[PDB]
Design a protein around this motif. Structure first.
Motif, PDB file in Angstrom:
ATOM      1  N   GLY A  33       0.845  -1.196   0.000  1.00 23.78           N
ATOM      2  CA  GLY A  33       0.000   0.000   0.000  1.00 23.78           C
ATOM      3  C   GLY A  33       0.883   1.249   0.000  1.00 23.78           C
ATOM      4  O   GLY A  33       0.730   2.144   0.825  1.00 23.78           O
ATOM      5  N   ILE A  76      -6.818  -5.083   2.913  1.00 21.69           N
ATOM      6  CA  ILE A  76      -6.710  -3.747   3.500  1.00 21.69           C
ATOM      7  C   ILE A  76      -5.238  -3.368   3.601  1.00 21.69           C
ATOM      8  O   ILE A  76      -4.374  -4.178   4.004  1.00 21.69           O
ATOM      9  N   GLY A  77      -4.950  -2.111   3.200  1.00 21.77           N
ATOM     10  CA  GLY A  77      -3.591  -1.615   3.320  1.00 21.77           C
ATOM     11  C   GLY A  77      -2.721  -2.000   2.117  1.00 21.77           C
ATOM     12  O   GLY A  77      -1.529  -1.679   2.100  1.00 21.77           O
ATOM     13  N   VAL A  85       3.362   3.156   5.356  1.00 22.10           N
ATOM     14  CA  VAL A  85       3.711   4.435   4.749  1.00 22.10           C
ATOM     15  C   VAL A  85       2.412   5.161   4.378  1.00 22.10           C
ATOM     16  O   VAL A  85       1.383   4.553   4.174  1.00 22.10           O
ATOM     17  N   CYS A  86       2.501   6.463   4.156  1.00 21.29           N
ATOM     18  CA  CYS A  86       1.340   7.230   3.779  1.00 21.29           C
ATOM     19  C   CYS A  86       1.827   8.388   2.910  1.00 21.29           C
ATOM     20  O   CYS A  86       2.755   9.088   3.269  1.00 21.29           O
ATOM     21  N   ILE A  98      -3.305   0.725  10.087  1.00 17.42           N
ATOM     22  CA  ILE A  98      -3.290   0.350   8.676  1.00 17.42           C
ATOM     23  C   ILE A  98      -4.714   0.439   8.119  1.00 17.42           C
ATOM     24  O   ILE A  98      -5.665  -0.036   8.733  1.00 17.42           O
ATOM     25  N   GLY A  99      -4.816   1.056   6.935  1.00 16.33           N
ATOM     26  CA  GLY A  99      -6.108   1.182   6.257  1.00 16.33           C
ATOM     27  C   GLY A  99      -6.929   2.356   6.782  1.00 16.33           C
ATOM     28  O   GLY A  99      -8.053   2.556   6.332  1.00 16.33           O
ATOM     29  N   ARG A 100      -6.342   3.137   7.698  1.00 15.45           N
ATOM     30  CA  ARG A 100      -6.959   4.360   8.187  1.00 15.45           C
ATOM     31  C   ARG A 100      -6.343   5.540   7.434  1.00 15.45           C
ATOM     32  O   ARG A 100      -5.628   5.323   6.468  1.00 15.45           O
ATOM     33  N   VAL A 155      -4.218   7.312   2.755  1.00 14.16           N
ATOM     34  CA  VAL A 155      -4.517   6.053   3.432  1.00 14.16           C
ATOM     35  C   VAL A 155      -3.184   5.421   3.820  1.00 14.16           C
ATOM     36  O   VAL A 155      -2.243   5.470   3.042  1.00 14.16           O
ATOM     37  N   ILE A 156      -3.124   4.852   5.032  1.00 15.43           N
ATOM     38  CA  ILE A 156      -1.899   4.280   5.576  1.00 15.43           C
ATOM     39  C   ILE A 156      -1.801   2.845   5.056  1.00 15.43           C
ATOM     40  O   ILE A 156      -2.689   2.007   5.291  1.00 15.43           O
ATOM     41  N   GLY A 157      -0.704   2.566   4.342  1.00 12.11           N
ATOM     42  CA  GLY A 157      -0.618   1.300   3.627  1.00 12.11           C
ATOM     43  C   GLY A 157       0.613   0.498   4.051  1.00 12.11           C
ATOM     44  O   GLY A 157       1.566   1.057   4.593  1.00 12.11           O
ATOM     45  N   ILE A 158       0.556  -0.813   3.787  1.00 11.59           N
ATOM     46  CA  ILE A 158       1.647  -1.711   4.156  1.00 11.59           C
ATOM     47  C   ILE A 158       2.830  -1.462   3.223  1.00 11.59           C
ATOM     48  O   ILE A 158       2.698  -1.405   2.006  1.00 11.59           O
ATOM     49  N   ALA A 159       4.033  -1.346   3.828  1.00 16.71           N
ATOM     50  CA  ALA A 159       5.257  -1.148   3.052  1.00 16.71           C
ATOM     51  C   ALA A 159       6.081  -2.425   3.083  1.00 16.71           C
ATOM     52  O   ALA A 159       5.895  -3.314   3.950  1.00 16.71           O
TER      53      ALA A 159
END
Ligand SMILES: *[Se]c1ccccc1C(=O)NCc1cccnc1
Ligand SMILES: *[Se]c1ccccc1C(=O)NCc1cccnc1
Ligand SMILES: [Zn+2]
Ligand SMILES: [Zn+2]
Ligand SMILES: [Zn+2]
Ligand SMILES: [Zn+2]
Lengths: 153, 153
Positions: free
Chosen positions: A51, A113-114, B5-6, B113-115, B148-152
């Motif tokens: 993400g 999600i994410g 990351v965002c 995450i996902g927020r 959106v806060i995503g997985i790095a």
């Protein structure tokens, strides 16, 4: 009862809103929405692993593949979790998306999600193209628009 | 061992990249990055509940508040999970972000995450502004940019 959303953005403008909803953790996910600004025809449609859109859609990495399988179409047993096939844009450049999928989830290690949703330049050949890349990416070409998949109300 | 990351974007010129790293699920989260295009001074900095950007930063909803507390600063016991205080922009409009926070998490319970992460128009008064809205939002004003806060990786 769980709902998630993704706003897709890229140049053209290619832009879309895709919604996901899952009634229960053991159940399918309904995916629906619209993407505009596309060339008429098929465009690969995938959840990618990261993400991370810090340098645009390139930072999203490869297809979301938590179970270490080869690339396929959504109907295939041998597919990546993120393999959602193609969306189809009409002559007006609009793809109205309506998918149900049983492999993505909004819970657990299949959860999206994410991660990043990406719509691609060309069709995904669903692992039937006959080259090395077919069973990895589906040969769907550049990333036209993407967004991070977020929790909805 | 977990990185997220965002990318912050909005209606105006405010744009930024924020990284979060957590070595262990029981441990603090390091937050670092940079935001540009800001007015010199303090700008509220919060995780909002929804990873939803359908109609811009407004669709992110209220501060992320799973434990039903009043709004506060990051060093307060009485705070929302999403209350990360203020970032500070210099004369050039650049805020170099460096935060360590014990309440947010990238795994386990109530993770971010996902927020949506949001940078605000005005200073967050950290629940010490002396009106009702202080204990809800911090009076930090409009949302200048969000992501959106995503997985790095
Ligand atoms: Se499903 C998932 C994947 C990555 C990170 C976080 C989650 C998650 O489950 N978050 C909890 C949640 C999910 C949907 C709605 N409300 C909370
Ligand atoms: Se980050 C988080 C917060 C609250 C609830 C669930 C999660 C989560 O990360 N869920 C997705 C998941 C769970 C187990 C293994 N892999 C991903
Ligand atoms: Zn792709
Ligand atoms: Zn794939
Ligand atoms: Zn806010
Ligand atoms: Zn708050």
């Amino acid at each position: 009862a769980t709902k998630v959303v993704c706003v897709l953005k890229g140049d053209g403008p290619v832009q879309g809103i895709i919604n996901f909803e899952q009634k229960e953790s053991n159940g399918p996910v309904k995916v629906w929405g619209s993407i505009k600004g596309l060339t008429e025809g098929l465009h690969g449609f995938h959840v990618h692993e990261f993400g991370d859109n810090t340098a645009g859609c390139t930072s999203a990495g490869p297809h979301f593949n938590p179970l270490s399988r080869k690339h396929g179409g959504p109907k295939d047993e041998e597919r990546h979790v993120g393999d959602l096939g193609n969306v189809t844009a009409d002559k007006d450049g609009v793809a109205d998306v309506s998918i149900e999928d049983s492999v993505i989830s909004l819970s657990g290690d299949h959860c999206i999600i994410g991660r990043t949703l990406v719509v691609h330049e060309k069709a995904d050949d669903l692992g039937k193209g006959g080259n090395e890349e077919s069973t990895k990416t589906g040969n769907a070409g550049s990333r036209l628009a993407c967004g991070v998949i977020g929790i909805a109300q």
